[PDB]
């Protein structure tokens, strides 16, 4: 009794596709972000914003298509369809890069929707909401890379564009301008991601190679029953093995799995902090001691200064086409180049 | 090189000469470590989330598990139920053996391909090259993001080992 | 002299590196794929100039 | 003075100490280059 309660009943039914209250936000925003990306990569250009072809329609392939950021002149305009720039014209809206803020924002609210879904289903099933909590890391990464980072810069233009090659360009840009590989926050990110992959692999393999024989089949998958009380593999044998091979080993299964949550989640969070620094060009770009020494001493060389030379190359050779709004003209004679090349 | 910045040097020069970002084996490698990280957090959080109550509020939940105990320490049925409702019932693993096999296989295969990426780009079979792939009706080049990548790669190429080349092509 | 052009690159802590810039530097391009154990060198000083440690390690 | 009933003993087991120390020492090994700059 009461439309609210009736509605709650309906939203929370155990259908094939759980809806929930969270679905009211999640499904339209997710669908619009995905649909926006497919629409854009299939039909939409980046000629007027970047001087780039970016769709299947223009001849790009899966690797090179993208929905690109708006032109630098748009600033951090929300670029709403009915806003002052597009004035309700869908075509000009596409041409002005509207699909980029469309996808970024519907995508953000979608991510919110999804994490809310994780909470709602956790609450309805009766389990602890650790999955949601862990999803905080994708959130931090998306919000910092796609929102905060360009908000700190001149405009949406320098946000990542939504495509494969575009993202690769984003990587190379961050190397050339931010020296992002040198940043200890990125390093912690890398450690969390590769350490996560390591834990995934090693844990999977370990369980699969300390299994109890619980059937007669040579394919061992059938010998498991979801409602069984017994562990399906030997924690004791696994512990002895890793203690003897690597010196240390898990002995607590609960700690093992919490740690598997903790490592990549913590990594992504750290990388997000670094990117927030980069929004302001607050980079880990140089070691001042290195520069003072190298400036005074033309025989002093390290991998650090070598990499700075590579970066300088990147900036000079890539900036005119990558930042067209600057109207850079770099005569041949000013381009940095080593011998012969 | 056996060092941190040296590793970055190696990577950048590698990208200059082989366009490894556009190589599908490196891409599979990324799918493997991104995926590995994702599934790591996923497994971790699900198992964590369905631990059977064995402790009070003032002690670590971990004391709820004793080393060598015969019973499973979490509710795999609850975990499965959650994960199946989160997506749909069938993307979920109800079989722990298949689940753990997947956890081993995804990053191991991905990384195998990463290794094969480096090991084949060793013989200069490089990433995809779409430089000037899109041309207009007159013949003007219409740049794509591939071409911007090419400009960055050019920066790296011309600057690397600045005193080592005497001839116009870097054939090794 | 990593690239074999008599342009030696410093990798160690005592020669001006920190943890992030430090490296054991790859052996010289003049060596190429030649096997360069300590006993192929005329001296440890030579060996070090040419990146022998990298190969050993 | 009535003793406070809300008090609770605190623990750090040895494995937690090793993990913690590892975390601190590795963080330090990482950030120290940037502290010296």
């Amino acid at each position: 009794r009461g439309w609210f309660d009736i509605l709650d009943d309906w939203l929370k039914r155990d259908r094939f596709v759980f809806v929930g209250w969270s679905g009211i936000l999640l499904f339209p925003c997710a669908y619009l972000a995905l649909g926006g990306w497919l629409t854009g990569t299939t039909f939409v250009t980046s000629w007027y914003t970047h001087g780039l072809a970016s769709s299947y329609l223009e001849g790009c392939n899966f690797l090179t298509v993208a929905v690109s950021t708006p032109a630098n002149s748009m600033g951090h305009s929300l670029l709403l369809l009915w806003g002052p720039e597009a004035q309700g014209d869908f075509t000009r809206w596409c041409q002005l890069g509207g699909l980029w803020t469309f996808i970024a924002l519907h995508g953000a609210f979608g991510l919110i929707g999804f994490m809310l879904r994780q909470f709602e289903i956790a609450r309805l099933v009766g389990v602890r909401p650790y999955n949601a909590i862990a999803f905080s890391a994708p959130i931090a990464v998306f919000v910092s890379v796609f929102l905060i980072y360009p908000l700190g810069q001149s405009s949406w233009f320098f946000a990542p564009s939504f495509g494969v090659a575009a993202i690769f360009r984003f990587l190379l840009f961050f190397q050339g301008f931010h020296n992002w590989t040198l940043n200890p926050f990125h390093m912690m990110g890398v450690a969390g991601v590769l350490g996560g992959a390591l834990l995934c692999a090693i844990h999977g393999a370990t369980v699969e190679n300390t299994l109890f024989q619980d059937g007669e089949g040579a394919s061992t998958f059938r010998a498991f029953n979801p409602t069984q009380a017994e562990e399906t593999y030997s924690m004791v044998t696994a512990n002895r093995f890793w203690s003897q091979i690597f010196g240390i080993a898990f002995s607590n299964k609960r700690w093992l799995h919490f740690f598997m949550l903790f490592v990549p989640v913590t990594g992504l969070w750290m990388s997000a902090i670094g990117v927030v620094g980069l929004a302001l060009n607050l980079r880990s770009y140089d070691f001042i001691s290195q520069e003072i020494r190298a400036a005074e001493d033309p025989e002093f060389e390290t991998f650090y200064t070598k990499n700075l030379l590579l970066n300088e190359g990147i900036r000079a050779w890539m900036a005119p086409q990558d930042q067209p709004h600057e109207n850079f003209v770099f005569p041949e004679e000013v381009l940095p180049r080593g011998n012969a090349l | 090189p056996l060092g941190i910045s040296g590793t970055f040097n190696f990577m950048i020069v590698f990208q200059a000469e082989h366009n490894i970002l556009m190589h599908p084996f490196h891409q599979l490698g990324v799918a493997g470590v991104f995926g590995g990280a994702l599934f790591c957090a996923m497994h971790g959080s699900l198992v964590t989330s369905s631990l059977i109550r064995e402790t009070t509020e003032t002690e670590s939940a971990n004391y709820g598990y004793k080393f060598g105990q015969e019973e499973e320490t979490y509710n795999i049925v609850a975990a499965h139920g959650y994960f199946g409702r989160l997506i749909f019932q069938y993307a979920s693993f109800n079989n722990s053996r298949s689940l753990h096999f997947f956890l081993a296989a995804w990053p191991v295969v991905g990384v195998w391909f990463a290794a094969l990426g480096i090991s084949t780009m060793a013989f200069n079979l490089n990433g995809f090259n779409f430089n000037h792939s899109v041309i207009d009706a007159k013949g003007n080049v219409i740049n794509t993001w591939a071409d911007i990548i090419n400009r960055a790669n050019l920066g790296m190429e011309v600057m690397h080992e600045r005193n080592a080349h005497n001839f116009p092509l870097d054939l090794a | 002299d990593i690239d074999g052009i008599r342009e030696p690159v410093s990798g160690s802590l005592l020669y001006g590196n920190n943890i992030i810039t430090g490296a054991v530097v790859p052996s010289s391009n003049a060596i190429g794929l030649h096997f360069y154990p300590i006993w192929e060198a005329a001296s440890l000083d030579e060996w070090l100039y040419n990146g022998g440690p990298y190969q050993l390690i | 003075m009535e003793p406070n009933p809300n008090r609770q003993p605190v623990e750090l087991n040895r494995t937690s100490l090793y993990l913690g120390l590892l975390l601190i020492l590795v963080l330090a090994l990482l950030f120290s280059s940037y502290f010296f700059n």
Binding site: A249 | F67, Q69 | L13 | L21, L22, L25, V26, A28, F36
Partner: peptide
């Protein structure tokens, strides 16, 4: 003193490896 710091921290980490392996709390079966 920078070099001494880097090497000090490293040395402590190795020491920690030694204690964490040979002076771990022994796993015990219940």
């Amino acid at each position: 003193m920078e070099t001494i710091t880097y090497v000090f921290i490293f040395a402590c980490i190795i020491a920690l490896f030694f204690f964490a392996i040979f002076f771990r709390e022994p796993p015990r079966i219940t």
